[PDB]
Amino acid sequence: MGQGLHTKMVQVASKALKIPISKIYISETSTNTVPNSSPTAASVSTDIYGQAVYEACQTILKRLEPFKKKNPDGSWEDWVMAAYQDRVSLSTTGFYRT
Amino acid sequence: ADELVFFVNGKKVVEKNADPETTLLAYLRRKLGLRGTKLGCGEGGCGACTVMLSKYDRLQDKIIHFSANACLAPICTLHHVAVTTVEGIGSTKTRLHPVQERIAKSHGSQCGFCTPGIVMSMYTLLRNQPEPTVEEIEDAFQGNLCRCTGYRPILQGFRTFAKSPSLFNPEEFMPLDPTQEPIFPPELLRLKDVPPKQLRFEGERVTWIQASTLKELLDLKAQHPEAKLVVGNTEIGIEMKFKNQLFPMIICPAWIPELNAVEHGPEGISFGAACALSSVEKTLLEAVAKLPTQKTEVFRGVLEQLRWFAGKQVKSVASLGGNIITASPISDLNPVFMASGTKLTIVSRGTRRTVPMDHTFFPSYRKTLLGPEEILLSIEIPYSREDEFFSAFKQASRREDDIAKVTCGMRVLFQPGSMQVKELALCYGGMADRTISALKTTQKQLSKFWNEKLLQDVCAGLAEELSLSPDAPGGMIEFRRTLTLSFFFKFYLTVLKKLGKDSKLDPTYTSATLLFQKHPPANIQLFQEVPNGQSKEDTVGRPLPHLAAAMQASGEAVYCDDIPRYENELFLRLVTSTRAHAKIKSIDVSEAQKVPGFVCFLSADDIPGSNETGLFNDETVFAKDTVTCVGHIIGAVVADTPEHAERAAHVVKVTYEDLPAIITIEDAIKNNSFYGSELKIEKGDLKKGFSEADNVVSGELYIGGQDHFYLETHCTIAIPKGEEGEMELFVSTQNAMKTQSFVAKMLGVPVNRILVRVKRMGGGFGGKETRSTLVSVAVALAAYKTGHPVRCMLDRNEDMLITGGRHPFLARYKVGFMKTGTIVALEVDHYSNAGNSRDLSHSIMERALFHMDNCYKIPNIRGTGRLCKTNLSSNTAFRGFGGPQALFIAENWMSEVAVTCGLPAEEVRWKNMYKEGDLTHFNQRLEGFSVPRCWDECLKSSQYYARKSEVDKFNKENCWKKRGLCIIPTKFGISFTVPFLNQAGALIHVYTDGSVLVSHGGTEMGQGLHTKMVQVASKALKIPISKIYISETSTNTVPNSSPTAASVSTDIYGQAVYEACQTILKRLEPFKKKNPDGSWEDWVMAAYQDRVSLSTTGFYRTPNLGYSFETNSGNAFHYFTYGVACSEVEIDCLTGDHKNLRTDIVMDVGSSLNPAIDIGQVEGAFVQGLGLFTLEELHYSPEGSLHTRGPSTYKIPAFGSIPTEFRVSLLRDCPNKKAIYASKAVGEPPLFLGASVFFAIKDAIRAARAQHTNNNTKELFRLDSPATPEKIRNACVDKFTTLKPWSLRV
Amino acid sequence: FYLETHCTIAIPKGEEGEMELFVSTQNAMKTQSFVAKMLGVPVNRILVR
Amino acid sequence: DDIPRYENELFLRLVTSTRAHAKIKSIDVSEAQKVPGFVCFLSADDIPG
Ligand SMILES: Cc1cc2nc3c(=O)[nH]c(=O)nc-3n(C[C@H](O)[C@H](O)[C@H](O)COP(=O)(O)OP(=O)(O)OC[C@H]3O[C@@H](n4cnc5c(N)ncnc54)[C@H](O)[C@@H]3O)c2cc1C
Ligand SMILES: Nc1nc2c(c(=O)[nH]1)N[C@H]1C(S)=C(S)[C@@H](COP(=O)(O)O)O[C@H]1N2
Ligand SMILES: Cc1nc(-c2ccc(OCC(C)C)c(C#N)c2)sc1C(=O)O
Ligand code: MOS
Ligand code: MOS
Ligand code: FES
């Protein structure tokens, strides 16, 4: 709504994943991607969504590890592709409870 | 004038600016927002646009109801007519109509795109006859095509309007109450009083003048000679849409009573030139029933023609006059009218003459002897005199609704009570550029007697008088000529029978003096019941109908183009190559830009990203520099309407400079034009193998390609957002992932910026596994460049020319074997015509090689494959994916081994069959090999042995008709041959009300994936299915998904969903425990409150996969689906036509998740199979231009094409531990089983050849696929197919 | 006094009571269940973006 | 509202109370129906849920 939530969330994911923000994008908010959400209020949205995003990024980094190891000098793109090929899921959820 | 007034579903429409070029289909969809009526061809052949028309007829003083194809109906012909669409008889939002209810509950709907039109065809019937007969119920669908169901279910369900567990209960069907049928529009009925006045309409380019009286018609024609008349528009509509014709001024005489008058005079019955064929048919039938047989000889002739003339929709609008004057070289009526000198009453202001039709009426191509100010007023089909006999024959590719190869009308008149010819006329269609009479040949017979010698002379006469030059248009020179002699032979034999009185002929001949006959259908379906004590809520294993059947049967189901259009949405029409290979030297759009509504012309230059697309980056988005096949996309036009983009696109001038083209597999081999290097699988010792083989056979076989013909053609809607290169696309595709990255590559933006959503496809079958991106990416560029959302749905012909199809195969084999029939060695070399692109062509070849063994153990084997790089649209995947081709070649040489050995085929096959534990040629254990059980059970329930006797008895007692009986098995490798594609994701959310929303990477196309997935989640979660819902497939809910293909979608997505459900059940446990007596809703809410996430992902990776052609090792498939089919046919060795009498299938689906979906899948794949092997055939000009581009020239199986007795069975007690809930993929496996029809036909051809040809019990004749009536007839060599150098050789 | 006042776009699909809504709101969840309660269809049938 | 509009997209204008507290004794739409483009008037009665 102008508070810069999506900007902050991109910044968090970029630090979390350790990739430029340019490779990250947030298009919108929808009930079919993340259900039963609390209203964007109480000023905690950054605190709580950022933690949820963060967690997601971790699952991702964990899944991609075996590949980063097998190819230390590789790029982010190399590892992602390698994970796709090895039929490793590149989609996860993140959640947080204060 | 000016005001067009009609009703649609009770509501009155007043169009103040009717444009003569507007069809009802477009009006209903664009202007009236009623998308229930679909567009499937626009030629009147599929019936997906079927609607009911009701009007008050004066002359009968009664309301009439008839079906009609909305795509050919000009709205200007509908003044004061009440239209009824699918949505006008019921809906899920209110209550379905018995017709819509039954088809849905009977599993008569799969992708459901054809369902609306079929619902209306059955509706019109019931609206005319509330209690139809099984025969009228079938004849109702001759203008309707379904590509999914195999037709059996549609007919079994509707059979209830007529007069072990089962797939449906007819006792729960709601009875049809006509007293509740929507009444005829009262207002519309009051207008019947007012005297018809002359109307006038003015569209963008055409002027329509609806005449109300004969006087006005004659005056109009006087003032405007060039003006074309239109009644049914089933001819003019085609010329305008397809032939690029513009008739600026049209006159519709339809209203004029004298053009609709029916009179029964002493010479015969007269019909006004506007009378619809259906009316003529009705009149004639009653005339035949009331008058003595001797007076109805010519009547019965017309009836036999009208019998296989289009369908109900076309015959209800097509006018008698319209057929005659169009003067089509292949008219089915003109030939009959000429042979009988039917009286034609021609008029014009002042003048009026009556002349009998004869050869002089058709001067030249499509021309007649009418004056530019003349109009045909009436036709008098003649009564039949004593000693006068008539006959009428027609032969095409498919019996139901088809353009004739050769059609005729034959008449003879003898001297009183004698056998001496007085008058003799033989008139044919399909032999010249106009209907002709074989006058020369018939002259020499006048005064001669009806005898064996006359028969001989005539055939010699016909053979000389109606010769065809090799360059004959339409080709099929031999077959066509043979048909004229064969037709006469039937006429000859029939007349003898008729000269036999009764109050004769050889015993084995009368069969050749009989018109087509439909025996009563008998179908049985048997599957296994679910465990006696299974929750009524655990739907897995029960025959639960397709969750969308009802909405598809009501027109509420939404397909891509059904999606409403934005106020600023633009339309795109692709501009394609007309040369098979050449340089693009210039593109001119001067003409296009002049068309109203033209926005812009897109070409390679406009692409912001890269023009390099395709699965292997060997394709272009838009052609640059050179075109490499006819139909190759060069650019596209965007305009404010579909019509404008189409017209504008048609005048874009491309100037080419031709290049050496490589069209066929031959030239491909000749010029060494391939893609990559040879593929191969070799096992054992060939040299050593043949060396030990008693007999050895070599050959060459060919299998034609195939068009998917999904009812909904390719379609894409692109919505440019405006920010960050964001774009949302609604596409009819089975590969959202590739659509996503291909669109992104073209635009040059990260993949995360593009969203692709797939509700459902009105059919895919592999045609949409990748080739859908051809349309998607083009629409995306238009969206990108214009800023407005853009859409495009291909027309049937564009779809057929561009999207690519099944791979045509060419095989060169050689098999060694022992007298016993045991195969010892094998060598098959496959060649597939790949098209101007790699695409999937390569993996298809591999699947082929993995199946060249079918169900047989071959110790020494070697198979190779090459991909022929040609200048034809790139071919792609097609239900079977290379498997069907390989299995066919396998069964061909196998059939030859049986003949050569002189042993029964089942025996040769059974002894050569794999055994539990054996290794394939690619070394993989066949665990749970059930072909044996399928084989035994099929042989037994089909009564194969008892019937084989029956077959031979028939062959003995029949001379011009034979019967074939064959039994084929099959095994299909389950899994993608690319290991990394065997992965699947799923996202499941449970909302606070307890309702669940599932999303997986799989898409729906009619196979019932979403239904099966709901069933799985309902069993998994242990809640009713009602609380679960799947809305669609989208790239933002489940990323990087493999295409919905390889038949594993249920296996893999169901596992992914299942996993998700588990995570959910695990999270909810603590709460179920804290509150055991609680409901699902209680626990969910409790979990929400305790801040426990109700959203998780699911994923699956198929274990132990990875075969290497390098070491012929490693599993290639997770398991195999097996099945056996037994078919029996009867061919007419004189025409080439045949009928499938009975087929018996036993499939091993393991423990079925849904026996209704699986069986509908078996029957459906089976029919597309018999289609590939015996009916569907594409033709191209030598230079690479496709000829067959519509249902009119490409005949897929029709309602009347399925085995009269269709029995399907799912193997009991055989759970498959390898896949979810013990089920097995059922998608592709059964399609090859349609080959049993092919080999059943070949079996019949042998009987024929043994009758009039060779005397070699072990002769091996080549019969390629498809076994068309042309191939069948030509293989039935006889004195007909059979019947001058200076010096010889000797 | 937000510069953009309240705004909502509802798109009825035609099947199973499905509806997609484009709303200017900070509570998609409540928009979702409230819309569903009014229509009387499961919450899974309504999409809010 | 910046989102493009569908060719058949209709517009809604809320009809509100002008009294701080009272009984609704009657609603007349005779005048409304006469306005060009009027489609319909929605009230509590139409709600399905
Ligand atoms: C799916 C499909 C299947 C078909 N199957 C067959 C088939 O099996 N056998 C076959 O023969 N045909 C077939 N046809 C062709 C078709 O039936 C005819 O061309 C139709 O009979 C013509 O009538 P109409 O009223 O539609 O004609 P229209 O489209 O109006 O066209 C008639 C033409 O005849 C002229 N004309 C019409 N009435 C008169 C009159 N009273 N006086 C003077 N000139 C006149 C018009 O000017 C025009 O050139 C098929 C068409 C479709 C679309
Ligand atoms: N009615 C219908 N059935 C169909 C299709 C289709 O497009 N329509 N696609 C076929 C093809 S080509 C395949 S690979 C499978 C895929 O089935 P699945 O999605 O359950 O794996 O369904 C088959 N059955
Ligand atoms: C039906 C079927 N499809 C297959 C396949 C093979 C390669 C592909 O893409 C290759 C690219 C990513 C390099 C895609 C896609 N998309 C699909 S294998 C197969 C089977 O049946 O084995
Ligand atoms: O006031 Mo902000 O929490 S909505
Ligand atoms: O032929 Mo189906 O895999 S697409
Ligand atoms: S679209 Fe009209 S018959 Fe196919």
Ligand code: FES
């Ligand atoms: S269900 Fe009939 S064409 Fe798909």
